[PDB]
Nucleic acid binder design. Structure first.
Ligand SMILES: [Zn+2]
Ligand SMILES: [Zn+2]
Lengths: 81, 100, 96, 125, 24, 208, 129, 87, 216
RNA sequence: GAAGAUGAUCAGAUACCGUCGUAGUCUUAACCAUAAACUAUGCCGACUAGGGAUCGGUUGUUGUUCUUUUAUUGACGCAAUCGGCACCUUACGAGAAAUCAAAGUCUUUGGGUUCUGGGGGGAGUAUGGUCGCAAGGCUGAAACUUAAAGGAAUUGACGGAAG
């Protein structure tokens, strides 16, 4: 390529490119509302959560930390914010 | 000058490799440098299968094979013609010779 | 970065580096060490008067085959004894 | 051995490339014909020259010979290789009446302004 | 000679000089 | 810009899609990526035939710029393009280069088949490198039929086609000949059906 | 580590114009870079350049149109007197009729032509031709 | 180049590549000159009217001469929606 | 009795092509030297260097003698010929043939004010062949050709009378010295100057406007 | 298995080959500070060309195999990435060339910085200093002598090298 549109790259290659190597860095991580199976209580949980987050109402661990994204326990449903 | 880019061995991202003794002369050669050949031969020559089978007390007995991994230094292999000198361009070809 | 400092405040490092490295140059070393003054038979001069101690003819080097005719001269200014050639045809006799 | 040299090979084949019609699949007439066309200093050389000439003609009769052109070979090849089967062998007649393209390529048809009947084939190999 | 042996030859000679200086 | 009749007709969309011109090599180089439409899950790559057809008109328009048809040279080392180029040479008046290409045909002026064409058309750059290489010695533009693994150096117009196909190669030469003759006016217009059938230009085995 | 944000930017321009690319991305940005680029447009050596804000040092996208030969910096930014400019231009510029020696003075970043017009002097900052 | 009196003392004003705008040398034997015809509304090639481009021998070697024409033919209308600015 | 075998040769045999700048304007390759004999009759050749190179055989040396020849018109066209042959005369004669085939145009430029005709180079140019790098710097109207005698003679035949030359490497190797000097002088039409920045339309090749006159 | 002794071979072998064999090889406390300690390529930083593999992590998706009957299994597969050890092609570019994605962005000579060299010897020697139990390490000349020594490649010649 000799002529390329650097200022408006196609979003297709933005989704595959590294977060620090994009035109402007942006986190791929997000926040979730986790409904535990025991009860319904909005608890905001980071996607890449390092801590075994438990619900405030119920002493139930929502997520177990992993190297990358934290894996929520079975019966836990999340909704992205 | 530099005859080979790999310097006649296979050490990259590495400091030291424990040496091996030549099968022919027990000379210490680095393991990644040694000429290594896998050898899976029959115990008996193909002519000796007719007379072994008839003398067998077992019906349809499979002859076990002779497994070996041979190690050579550069001098051991060349003299025994395990490897041969190649032209300056054909030295780069590292795909195995087509024989089997 | 060419291996030598480029900072605007690196004039001392550059001046020192060259000063040390001039000692590798043979002409510069002989001037400052004063070898010609100390060890050269002429003492660093151009010409030198001396006294002929005898006359000697020296074999030429290879591949040539001859005998070069010189003299052995003792110097007045510094007492050294050297060999001096006589470049011409047939004035070995004129020097005694 | 009886391998012909280049001076008898190239001299002979020039004769075909210039006098193809009047030559014949018989040596003796060719032997006499090459005696009048080319100046040959030795009769052994002419018998060598004429011998390869007829043998080349025997090869020209049984197929197309390599390296010889005499202004009638290729012209005869021009009007022979016009063969065309009545069915275009590319038309949508061998099939049931529509293309057999892949399911992925079906989107390509829809992307362009083309509404072509298609039997979707899902290989996924 | 061989460079390695010339280095070894000088070491034997160098040790001779050290021993001689030890007498005085 | 261009008359709207030059767009891809549904009939050609049938013919081009029939000969699997849209199948491109599994390995695609960085230069031929814009001609790729999507990937097939097996590993096969899809040629953007909409772009492919548009390259046919562009290259054919370059041929019409050449005054003498004898100055347009077509070459092919593959047997699949052996048959096509000959009647392409015959129909258009172009100069065919049948079989092996003798080195020095363009650079050495004492050779027997010493040509100086104003344009060279190549069936496959990878199998016809010698003609492409010599073109870069005597200032000759090159139009090459390139797959997705075809090298792209010293080629000006890349017509994406399946060079490893029986019927794909012959179809392209048919399409080029049809468009080249249309522009000069031999074919009266763009709606009439041509005397030359797609079966012609298709390589025939010695069996028959 | 990164010691001269200007030198890194001009290097990417040279490696892009010898190759024939018509655009180049500069990271990071600085006012010295932006003002050095403006002198290029006044003499036409580049097209528009686009500064991207990322709440950081920034990024710059430049449009190259091939009428540039070589642009570089002179390290360090030597002190240049008015009488010194004649020596500097001879050894850096290909001819006396074109080419520019960029100086930074208290009057702003400018080339040696308008530097001689207003008769002020500063540091040498780079060259362009 | 022109002298004091104003006459164009420059002999052999060279040409420039249509892709990189570099000067095409006299011995640039890899350089080409692509000529694309003009087509009237009837679909017939116009005699003696051509759209011409100059290619440096540089761009042909790097393989970018194919992309250069596609953009150049896109801007001049000779092609439609085949070359993408956004990559 | 000269029968051209190339399209441009048939064109230059007739009055179709009259100025060598037309050949240069389209980078048309030259293969037969009779072309510029008609176009540039004022050509001056001189032998720069004659060398004998030996090839060792089973019996002894097989000596061939090599000549380097410079050709120029003193008005901006210059070429360099290097050819090896068994005899000196044939080496010189064949080098003169191939020296003509490589004649290239140079750009004379102005140092300082553009009064009079151009006399120097428009910019500094350098050419490298082997270890020899030869740099040409424009000089004022007073200085002659400030160069070594070998490089000086080349610059004379190109019409340059005001130039500085600085050489690095083993300049005693004449062949690399002349090729590097030849390479430098050909870069005059390779440096994009502001006066050449003005874009011009592309005239069609004379091989196109005269396709019929050069068909065969 | 240095040393040593021994049996061969040889004109001679206190060498190569064979048989023993002492220090050493191993380990614990300390010294030593040198290697073709090599990638013969200092470190940090940015840019320049394509491609396929591979290790670790991460992110999304299976006619796969499997826990277990399936999921929250695992392996496999397909895509992206960051990091690495590298490999293949080309040479825009460099180089005396071999060759080099760095040995490129170097007469169009300047990103920062440390170290080293100035023809071959004499010589890493002498002397002084310093460290070490020593063996030695580090620093380190001069007299005198010499027109060459050397690098890469080519042709030939030769080889107790292959085909
Ligand atoms: Zn809860
Ligand atoms: Zn060994």
């Amino acid at each position: 390529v000799l002529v390329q549109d650097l200022l408006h790259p196609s979003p297709a290659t933005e989704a595959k490119q590294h977060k620090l190597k994009t035109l402007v860095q942006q986190p791929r991580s997000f926040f979730m509302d986790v409904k535990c199976q025991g009860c319904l209580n909005i608890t905001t949980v980071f996607s890449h959560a390092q801590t075994a987050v438990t619900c405030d109402s119920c002493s139930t661990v929502l997520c177990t930390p992993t190297g990358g994204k934290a894996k929520l326990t079975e019966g836990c449903s999340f909704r992205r914010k | 000058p530099k005859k080979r880019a790999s310097n006649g061995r296979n050490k990259k991202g590495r400091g030291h490799v424990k040496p091996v003794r030549c099968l022919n002369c027990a000379r210490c050669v680095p393991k990644d440098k040694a000429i290594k050949r896998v050898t899976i031969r029959n115990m008996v020559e193909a002519a000796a299968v007719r007379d072994l089978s008839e003398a067998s007390v077992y019906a349809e007995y499979a002859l076990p094979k002779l497994y070996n991994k041979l190690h050579y230094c550069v001098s051991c292999a060349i003299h025994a013609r395990i490897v041969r000198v190649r032209s300056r361009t054909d030295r780069k070809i590292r795909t195995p010779p087509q024989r089997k | 970065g060419k291996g030598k400092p480029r900072g605007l405040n690196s004039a001392r490092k550059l001046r020192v580096h060259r000063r040390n490295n001039r000692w590798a140059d043979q002409a510069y070393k002989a001037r400052l060490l004063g070898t010609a003054f100390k060890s050269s038979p002429f003492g660093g001069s151009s010409h030198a008067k001396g006294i002929v101690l005898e006359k000697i003819g020296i074999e030429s080097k290879q591949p040539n085959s001859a005998i070069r005719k010189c003299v052995r001269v003792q110097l007045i200014k510094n007492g050294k004894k050297v060999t001096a050639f006589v470049p011409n045809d047939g004035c070995l006799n004129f020097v005694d | 051995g009886r391998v012909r040299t280049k001076t008898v090979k190239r001299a002979s084949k020039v004769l075909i490339e210039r006098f193809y019609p009047k030559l014949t699949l018989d040596f003796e007439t060719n032997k006499r014909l090459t005696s009048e066309i080319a100046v040959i200093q030795s009769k052994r050389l002419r018998n060598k020259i004429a011998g390869y000439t007829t043998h080349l003609m025997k090869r020209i009769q049984k197929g197309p010979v390599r390296g010889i052109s005499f202004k009638l070979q290729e012209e005869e090849r021009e009007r022979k290789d016009q063969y065309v089967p009545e069915v275009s062998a590319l038309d949508l007649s061998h099939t049931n009446g529509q293309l057999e393209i892949d399911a992925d390529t079906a989107d390509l048809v829809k992307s362009l302004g083309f509404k072509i009947p298609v039997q979707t084939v899902s290989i996924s190999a | 000679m061989r460079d390695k042996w010339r280095k070894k030859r000088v070491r034997r000679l160098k040790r001779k000089r050290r021993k001689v200086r030890a007498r005085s | 810009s261009l008359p709207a009749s030059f767009d891809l007709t549904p009939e050609d969309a049938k013919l081009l899609l029939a000969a699997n011109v849209h199948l491109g090599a599994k390995n695609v180089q960085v230069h031929n990526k814009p001609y790729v439409y999507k990937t097939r899950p097996d590993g096969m790559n899809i040629i953007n035939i909409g772009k492919t057809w548009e390259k046919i008109v562009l290259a054919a328009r370059i041929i019409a710029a050449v005054p003498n048809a004898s100055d347009v040279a077509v070459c092919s080392s593959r047997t699949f393009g052996q048959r096509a180029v000959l009647k392409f040479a015959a129909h258009t008046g172009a100069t065919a280069i049948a079989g092996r290409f003798t080195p020095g045909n363009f650079t050495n002026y004492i050779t027997r088949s010493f040509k100086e064409p104003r344009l060279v058309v190549v069936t496959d750059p990878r199998t016809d490198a010698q003609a492409i290489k010599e073109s870069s010695y005597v200032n000759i533009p090159v139009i090459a039929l390139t797959d997705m693994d075809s090298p792209s150096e010293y080629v000006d117009v890349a017509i994406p086609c399946n060079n490893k196909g029986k019927h794909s190669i012959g179809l392209i030469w048919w399409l080029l000949a049809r468009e080249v003759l249309r522009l000069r006016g031999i074919i009266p217009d763009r709606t009439t059906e041509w005397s030359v059938m797609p079966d012609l230009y298709f390589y025939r085995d010695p069996e028959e | 580590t990164r010691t001269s944000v200007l030198a890194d930017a001009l290097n990417a321009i040279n490696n892009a114009e010898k190759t024939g690319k018509r655009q180049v991305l500069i990271r990071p940005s600085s006012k010295v870079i932006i003002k050095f680029l403006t002198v290029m447009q006044k003499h036409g050596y580049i097209g528009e350049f686009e500064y991207i804000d990322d709440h950081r040092s920034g990024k710059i996208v430049v449009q190259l149109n091939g009428r540039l030969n070589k642009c570089g910096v002179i390290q360090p930014r030597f002190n240049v007197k008015i009488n010194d400019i004649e020596r500097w231009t001879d050894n850096l510029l290909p001819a006396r009729q074109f080419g520019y020696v960029i100086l930074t003075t208290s009057a702003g970043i400018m080339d040696h032509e308008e530097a001689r017009r207003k008769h002020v002097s500063g540091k040498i900052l780079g060259f362009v031709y | 180049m022109e002298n004091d009196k104003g006459q164009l003392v420059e002999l052999y004003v060279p040409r420039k590549c249509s892709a990189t705008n570099r000067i095409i040398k006299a011995k640039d034997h890899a350089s080409v000159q692509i000529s694309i015809a003009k087509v009237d509304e009837d679909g017939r090639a116009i005699a003696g009217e051509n759209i011409t481009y100059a290619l440096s021998g540089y761009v042909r070697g790097r393989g970018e001469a194919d992309d250069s024409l596609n953009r150049l033919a896109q801007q001049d209308g000779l092609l439609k929606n085949v070359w993408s600015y956004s990559r | 009795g000269w029968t051209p075998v190339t399209k441009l040769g048939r064109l230059v045999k007739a009055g179709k092509i009259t100025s060598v700048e037309q050949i240069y304007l389209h980078s048309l390759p030259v293969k037969e030297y009779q072309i510029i004999d008609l176009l540039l009759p004022d050509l001056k050749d001189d032998v720069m260097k004659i060398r004998s190179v030996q090839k060792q055989t089973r019996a002894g040396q097989r000596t061939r003698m090599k000549a380097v020849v410079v050709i120029g018109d003193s008005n901006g066209h210059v070429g360099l010929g290097i050819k090896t042959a068994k005899e000196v005369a044939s080496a010189i004669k064949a080098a003169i043939v191939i020296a003509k085939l490589s004649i290239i145009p140079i750009r004379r430029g102005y140092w300082g004010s553009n009064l009079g005709q151009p006399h120097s180079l428009p910019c500094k140019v350098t050419g490298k062949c082997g270890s020899v790098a030869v740099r040409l710097i424009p000089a004022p109207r007073g200085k002659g050709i400030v160069a070594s005698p070998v490089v000086k003679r080349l610059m004379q035949l190109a019409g340059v009378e005001d130039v500085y030359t600085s050489s690095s490497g083993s300049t005693r190797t004449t062949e690399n010295t002349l090729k590097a000097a030849f390479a430098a002088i050909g870069n005059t039409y390779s440096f994009l100057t502001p006066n050449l920045w003005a874009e011009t339309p592309l005239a069609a090749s004379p091989l196109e406007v005269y396709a019929e006159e050069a068909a065969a």
